[model samples]
Target: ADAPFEGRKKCSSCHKAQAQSWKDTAHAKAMESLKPNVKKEAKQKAKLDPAKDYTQDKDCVGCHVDGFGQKGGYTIESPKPMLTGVGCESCHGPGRNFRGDHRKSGQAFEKSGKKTPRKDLAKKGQDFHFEERCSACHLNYEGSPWKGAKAPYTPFTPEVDAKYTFKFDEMVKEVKAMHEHYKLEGVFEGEPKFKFHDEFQASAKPAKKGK
Candidate 1:
């Protein structure tokens, strides 16, 4: 469950409550993409050598599949099973360390031994690792492997994708940077691709909530 949904169902099996809530959501299907016909159209319309440009070579798999399928001696159909469509691990990191009963042991999932509650899972998502989560695949650079050597794919623009959807929930409203597209700006500056903000504010004044 590294970068694909292979582990999505697994995570779902345990986090049934949250999974049920997101089961039919756009965010849940946020990973599955590139309809079959779109792949065909991309192939017929684009100019890419499949062997050398595997990542952006075939339009469908290029964007649909998980993990940038680039680098020497790689095949569109040969990558690991988890490399299909952006999945759970893309944002959560490899689940090998925190995937099972260990979560119930009250052990910290991070190197810092911090324990986060299930109901507050959304709060933990505020870590830059999580807030700017979608940007890893969205905002990219020229030589970025996911982007391939060619121009970025269509329908990947921040405006197009962002405007089409909105993630509104109490947790996100309280976390300001949780909704920031700031990661992309840093990637443009040749910095580490990921960074998150702290304590997002739902209101500028908090008038309703008594102090």
Candidate 2:
């Protein structure tokens, strides 16, 4: 029951490119942006610290860390090297058990030593990456099955999902403004969703009326 949720380091020797790319992205700094004076003057109003607080805490760690540590899953600052950032394992389940055997197979971890394909790993994590997952930490919601007595799990419904939420359109407009500052007019196909403060993006919309 006390199984340790491993992290990204284990994925590095295998998913080299993805691991390295994410390390430099804002997802890696999602936790760090919470520190004092690290973000910006305007962002200071929140007055929170990633290393110590929770208000601003849950906002960032959603995409940055692996499983939820508070719920007995893996954590970000576990000192396990891999657990520190938004790496391959952060989305895919921990590579702890499969890591060893994965190495023996010439580092070909397209399946975590299972017969499944790499595409399957992509799908699992993708399913969990919508606004619901982000809101699991960013916005307030009922807890999950693993939540302690203080919290209880509630089925996540779309109507309930819209009950309490941030203004996503504004965030998209703000990001679109950055195109000039960063000189990324053509680089970004649309607005950049990941930002330090006041991060906003379009809510994940389901299929429209008829297919």
Candidate 3:
């Protein structure tokens, strides 16, 4: 089952600093950049109608909004402001199931004074691939609205990609460094961004039944 998304605002209660930093980032601005008044070039290439509300446009909304079409995700009507943009849940998967586990682990650590290893804490999180999620919207795919008839945008080839392609590794490093803001410190220095989930998944112990 696709879990209902908890808004990033809810995440802020526990992750204040990280959420604050994320607020200033491109991910937070995902929906805002899609406004009819903005990104004129993108709208033209995507065949998005500036006269109509692109928020309600099926072809465009999924990438602009968080959790679109899934349970408790974005919809044309009554969209939650917290769920308006690509957010914590977009990269971390739906928060409902794992959030409780995360909180519980923290409380347990607080009471026992034995810190749960970082990998163990990460296990309580929903596993996701940063690369896969980024590519889902950034890369032109088979059904991409930016391509074909009215708008003929081509997907990138290995030799020709986004402007910051050379700095891609550095960009990933910056995001991985955000772990410090999340209160998961020190690990970022030695850790390659991609190894984050790989190491966590390999070292994580299975959750206890009912935990």
Candidate 4:
């Protein structure tokens, strides 16, 4: 039951605006973090070829690109630029199976004069476990790449969790900026612009004072 997984550009054909916004997100630029020039420098300085490492190195590719080590997945040897970076499939799973399914359903609904086009699409859409897919990269447990010397964040632990009160919901909202919702007919439905930290602080129980 293997579907012929197409690249993100195919998704863009129907989702023109959302795909354009995705181009501006950090996920869209994920591969740029390991550019050719940076690859050479990182190889010399960090003793790791990001290009080679990203494919062979699960530690790097797991977060930086779309499906890896799977059928129709990203590979350094033949990394399709349109398929590079964290694309629609990264969050939605492979689209080939349901992509056309949704299009056909949309047309059927339109002809039948049904208004629940989104409902039809949602039903056919891939089911993604928020914690499983997101925390695969976002969660900062021990042995994480963030622990590397070049990493910007210090080790995340229960202590940091207590102080920061890691707000998963809010973080998801911010990450949702990459995709603006739309109708099957291409009506822009806008995206969430929630201030995560502010929402986190407002709802947080005040920390116990004095260490």
Candidate 5:
């Protein structure tokens, strides 16, 4: 329960390509949407009051910010610079324990093509089930079981716009906007049984329809 959050800045030095790609993503600037007069048109289109500030609202902040209401993560009282928006840890899980091993393994693989087992990193908190994480916010609704999802939930959903209709397998691939996918030469070697989308994507049940 006390997992530490090592924010995007810590990840940037090693993952330049992904970090650069994430710069312009919706998730990157997600916190900005909670501000007054920010993305007014989008808010309006979703039937939300454009002038209303959602930043301070507990229901909204958790999804936009990194690890809100969680251990060593973002806090409304003392928000950290690196933990503001939906950063690397938002998807990859907290980098506190795995980052060093991941870096070392990456170095070893790059230097001699010595592929390390992914489960070794996963054991340290590298989340392979990212689709479930993504679904937590994207699919949250009044009846949804996502943490703290009850009243005053997100306005953006399939009910508001057909565009929000989420298909984890298909949308997981378009994570191109979130971060460009790159070829990892020796990372997944001999891991024929491991497939991110096949395993993770299936966990997202279709969100219940609004009545």
Candidate 6:
């Protein structure tokens, strides 16, 4: 069975920094953007009706809101603050099963000052390989490598603007895309950090040749 969503409060209680950073991001406000007349300029560019309230649309809400159509997820009949936008559980998986394990491990680590093994967390149901998770909604389009991207597809394509292009390796570390990466010094017992850590940072685009 899929774990029930425990809401962002459970995550914010311990992850204060991450929560604060997430407050300013697009994902945090994704639900609000679907309201009529919001994002007028972008909607015009995409040929979408800015007057249409997309918050009520199933195709739009599944990606805009957290865990829509899933266990303990958002429903059109029930509007809720925790389930309103793309939230902690959206990318991390529902927290019900794993949060207790996280709490126990956290206490042990604080008591001993030793990096706790996170192997058990995976067993409890924390998500791994989040780049794949990102693609579930962001890459739903035509002319894409992801096979699941089908019509009726995303309106904003590379044909509309070059900025629509997505590269997981490049976009993964974007501060606006997610939270800021604070130093995790001595937090975990490993060389690489976080799940599927990108080995290389995005390369600087070279300066154009002088005219």
Write the residue-wise lDDT of candidate 3 on 1-211 in tens digits. Answer: 3567877766777776667667777767877765667766555554555555556656666776778778878787787888887888877777777677667666765666544444432454454346555555554444433232222222232334345232333554564332323324222222223465554445433432121
Model 5, 1-211: lDDT tens per residue? 2358967886887666667778789899988999998889878888777899988788678989888767778888887879988999888888788888877877787788787776776777777657767877777776444565555466787777878776776776665545665444445333323366444335433322121
> What tens-digit string does per-residue lDDT give for candidate 4 at 92-158?
6677667776566557656775433333333454533344455555555654433323332223334
- What TM-score would candidate 6 get against the native? 0.84
The top-ranked prediction according to TM-score is: 6
Tell me the spans in candidate 6 whose CA falls farther than 4 Å from its real position.
150-152, 185-211
Model 3, 171: alpha-carbon shift in Å?
3.8
Question: lDDT (CA) for every model shown?
Answer: 0.37, 0.39, 0.57, 0.55, 0.73, 0.72
RMSD (CA, Å), candidate 1 to true, equals 11.6
Clashes of 3: 0
Distance (Å) between predicted and true CA of 97, model 4?
0.9
Off by over 4 Å in 2: 1-4, 45-64, 70-81, 98-133, 141-211
lDDT of 6 by residue, 27-47 (tens): 999888889999999888888
Where model 1 places Cα greater than 4 Å from the true spot, the runs are 1-6, 30-33, 36-85, 104-128, 141-154, 158-211
lDDT of 1 by residue, 1-211 (tens): 2221344556555444444444454434433333333334433434432233333345435444433443311135565444455444545544443554335433343344444433233222212245344444444434333334344444434343344232323334422222221111110122222222222222222222110
Kindly report which residue pairs in candidate 2 clash with one another: 8-82, 9-82
Error of 4 at 5 (Å): 4.0
C-alpha lDDT of residue 108 in model 4: 61
Counting clashing residue pairs in each candidate, in order, gives 6, 2, 0, 0, 0, 0
Model 3 TM-score on a 0 to 1 scale: 0.66
- How does candidate 5 score on lDDT? 0.73
